[model samples]
Structure formats: structure tokens, C-alpha cells
Target: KVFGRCELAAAMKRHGLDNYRGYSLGNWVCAAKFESNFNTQATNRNTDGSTDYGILQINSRWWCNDGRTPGSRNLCNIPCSALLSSDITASVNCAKKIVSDGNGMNAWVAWRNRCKGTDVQAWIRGCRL
Candidate 1:
């Protein structure tokens, strides 16, 4: 909720996301837009009953401790509620770890559908980062 395009990019750049292990700023922006429109408090319940949380819509199926009755794998270890916080530090770090563990950004369905091989320059259009 706190970040617009420029602010998000600058924050990420300051945190080294532009070059962190070859991660792309454009890809991240595009994915975030499609996933949650960059809304940090966003949440969605999937058909499988697992929920997606925060800016990236990280799934409870394998990502975070969502605190559901049935529960999730919680591989990311951080509480899903933590991602809803205004500060994206935990969210960003978790997302980075997920991407590193999986096949690039393909871990995010939004990235595969909306960002892969697409011209995502507009995500950072006026943002120098």
C-alpha cells in the first residue's frame, strides 16, 4: 500500500534488488503489478484452499506460516501476516529466496504469465532505479 512505482523501485534498488543474484527490476515490478497491484496487504484464497499473501501473493501452500487450521508447509518460515506489514523487507527477502530456490522467477505465476520475455520497461519508466 505504501509504494508507488518509483518508490518501490528506489527501495528495491537501495536493497540491491537490481543486481541481487541477477534479479531483474523490470520483471519484479511487472509481477508485483499483476499479482497484487503492488498492494502489500493483499490476500487471496485459492481454489485449493491455500491463501496467497502480500505484494507477491506468496502462496501458503509452500511459502509462509499462514496460521490456517489445516496449515501449510510454511517453507519460507516467516509468518504470512508479516508480509502484510508496510515495510516490504521481509516480503522482499522471502520472494528473493523463493526465486533462488526455484527456476528463476517462474516460481511466481504472474512472472511467467506477465513478465517472461515481455517488455516490462514501463514498470520502471520514470523511476531511475
Candidate 2:
């Protein structure tokens, strides 16, 4: 429902990312492939629609829901909310910005490591935090 991998790479580049980080973006996009499959507009909320929200499975009930707007500007300083209403590629690019920029190349690098061999179990195990 969004841009393909090539377009995704371009989007990430605009946000100051490279192939490795773009690969990380693809991994996060594939996270939805596991949990929900890149459903940007997906929402699993109360009957009254009081919670749950956009792509990357961003939940507001926790630390991001400010009602007005909550951004991914915390420790990673990602500001993923910048892509809140956009496509999955946008969200991926935004998240990469925060992880790589705020943390370090290692941040995105770690994510890339997970998808290297399709070891979902092993990959999850590798991520300590």
C-alpha cells in the first residue's frame, strides 16, 4: 500500500540515510509484515476509539499520546510522528533519522543485523534493549 523498496530507499536518503539504514527501514517495515503487515492506517482501539494509532504500531496510551500530538523525540530523538499521517516509507525514514541520528550508526546497524539471515527468533534475542 506504500512505496516499494526502491522508493523507500529514496525517501530514506532524503532524510539523510544510506543503504544500510535503508535496510533497517525495510526491516521495520517488515516488522509489520510479522505483527500486522505495514498497516499504516491500522488501529486496534476501544469501541469508543479512545486509543491505538498509526503505523509502526505507535500507541498513544503509553508515552506518545498527547491528544494534540506526540512525537518520537525521546532518547532516540526520532520524531517519527513526522510521518504519522504519511505512508509506511515516511514512517521508516523518520524512525531511521532518530535511531541513527540520536543514537548512532550502531542503532540502525543493530536493526540491520536482525534481518541479515531471517532468524526472527535469533534476531529478537539479539536486541538486548
Candidate 3:
């Protein structure tokens, strides 16, 4: 499922991303915008033989178990396929783990390159959340 900008913002906030780990809702929304464009089925194969899955692009190397990434820690303790579901609960839950695991939002390179240090408010503007 591909979510509208404000829709994703509202949903993410409902899942406790607002002020999560000191990262604002806009930060998470902005990262999703660049990472998967709000598409739940998004996937990216990395050069390291790992894959990024779902809206927040949870990685297989450390966060999810794809059965393909060798020596994966599966720190999120979830199958990568769960992240592709239209229901985003699992993705959000896994993302929370990712943030709280000491990496914070900077775990996403897309966030670091695009959303970081930028005014992300525009990502959620005009949303009646």
C-alpha cells in the first residue's frame, strides 16, 4: 500500500513515532518519503547482499531475518516479509527497536542524507492529525 503523505504521518504518530527517541514525526515521515515513498512493498537489494524492506526500509543485515542475509543478527526478531504488509504495525514496531538500539534515526542512510538537519515540517504540513 502506498500512503499519502499526511496519512502516513498520522499513522506513524498513532504508532508512537511522534517524539520517539527524540526524533519528531516529521523526521520519520521524511525518511519514509525518501526511503520507500510510503510504499509498504518497497524493497532494495544492497551491494552487501542485504536487502532493505518496507516503508522504513528495515535492513536484513541487522534488523530483520530474510533467510538470505548471511549471519544476520535479526535484532528486530522479525521476518523481513512482515515489513511488506499493508498493516504497518510490525514495521513500526521494528522501527522502534531500530531507533532504540543506539543507532537512533541515523540508522537510515536516507534519513542521514535527506531528512537529517533539514526542516522536515513540510512533510506533515496541512495534515489534520
Candidate 4:
């Protein structure tokens, strides 16, 4: 599922993403925009043999278990495939864990390179919160 900006914002809010770990909903929206364009089924293979999955591009190497990424931690304790579901609950939950694990939003390089130090509010403008 590919979500519109506002739609994705609302979904993230529903999952308690607003101001999570001191990051705004806009930050999450912005990260998702660059990471996967809000596409739930998005996947990218890394040069290191790990893969990123789903909208926020949760990585298999450190986050989810794909039975493929060597030395996977599966810190989120979920199958990587769960991130590809349109429901987004698992993805959001895992993302929360990622942020809470002392990494904050910097867990996503997209957030660091594109959303960081920018006007992230633009990502959620007119979304009605």
C-alpha cells in the first residue's frame, strides 16, 4: 500500500508516533517518504547481504529476522515479512523499538540525510494532526 502524506501521518499517529522519543510525526513521515515512498511492500537489498523491508525500511541485519541476514539480532523479535504488511502495526511497533533502543530516529539513514535539521513540519502540513 502506498499512502498519501496525510494518510501516512494519520496512521503513524494512530500508532503513537507523534513526539515519540522526542521526534515528531512529521519526522516519521519524512523518513518514510524517502525510505520507501510510503509503499508497504518496499524492499531493498544492502551490499552487506542484509535487506531493508517495508515502508520505514526496517533492516534485517539488526531489526527483524529474515533467516538470511548473517548475524541478525532480530531485536524487534519479528519476522521481516511482517513489515511488508499493509496493516503497518508491526512495522510501527518495530520502529518504536528501534528508536527507543538509544538510536532515536537516526536509526534510519534517510531520516538523517533527508529529514534531519530540515523543516520536517512540511511533511505533515494540512494533515489535521
- 30, model 2: CA deviation in Å? 1.4
Q: What are the RMSD figures for all models against the true structure?
A: 1.5, 8.9, 0.8, 0.8
lDDT of 4: 0.94
Q: lDDT of all predictions, in order shown? A: 0.82, 0.43, 0.94, 0.94
Residue pairs clashing, model 3 = none
Against the true structure, candidate 3 reaches a TM-score of 0.97
Candidate 2 structure quality by residue, lDDT tens digits, 1-129: 444444433454455543454444445534444433344555554343343344444434332433543332233233425334655555554455444554443333333454445643432232322
Alpha carbon lDDT of residue 125, candidate 2? Answer: 34
**lDDT value, residue 31 of candidate 3:** 96
The lDDT of model 1 is 0.82
TM-score of each: 0.91, 0.41, 0.97, 0.97
For residue 29, model 3's alpha carbon misses the true position, in angstroms, by: 0.4
Question: For candidate 4, what is the total of clashing residue pairs?
Answer: 0
